[PDB]
């Protein structure tokens, strides 16, 4: 009804620039290299 998918985008905004989660997501990124 509200839209929890809106915070998702904002969450990614953080990844752009502290949190284990963001780090876990970054790992998957670098994972590409590996």
Experimental method: NMR
State the sign of the Cα–Cα–Cα–Cα dihedral 1, 9, 21, 28.
positive
Q: In whole angstroms, what is the distance from residue 29 CA to residue 6 CA? A: 22
Pick the closest to residue 29 from 13, 16, 19 (CA basis).
16
At residue 21, the 3 state secondary structure works out as helix
For residue 25, give the DSSP letter. H
Domain layout of the chain by residue ranges = 1-34
For residue 4, give the DSSP letter. T
Q: In whole angstroms, what is the distance from residue 25 CA to residue 29 CA? A: 7
Alpha helices by DSSP H, 1-34: 5-16, 20-31
**Distance, first Cα to last Cα, the chain:** 40
């Amino acid at each position: 009804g509200i839209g929890a998918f809106g915070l998702l985008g904002f969450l990614a905004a953080g990844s752009k620039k502290k949190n284990e989660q963001e780090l876990l997501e970054l790992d998957k990124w670098a994972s590409l290299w590996n």
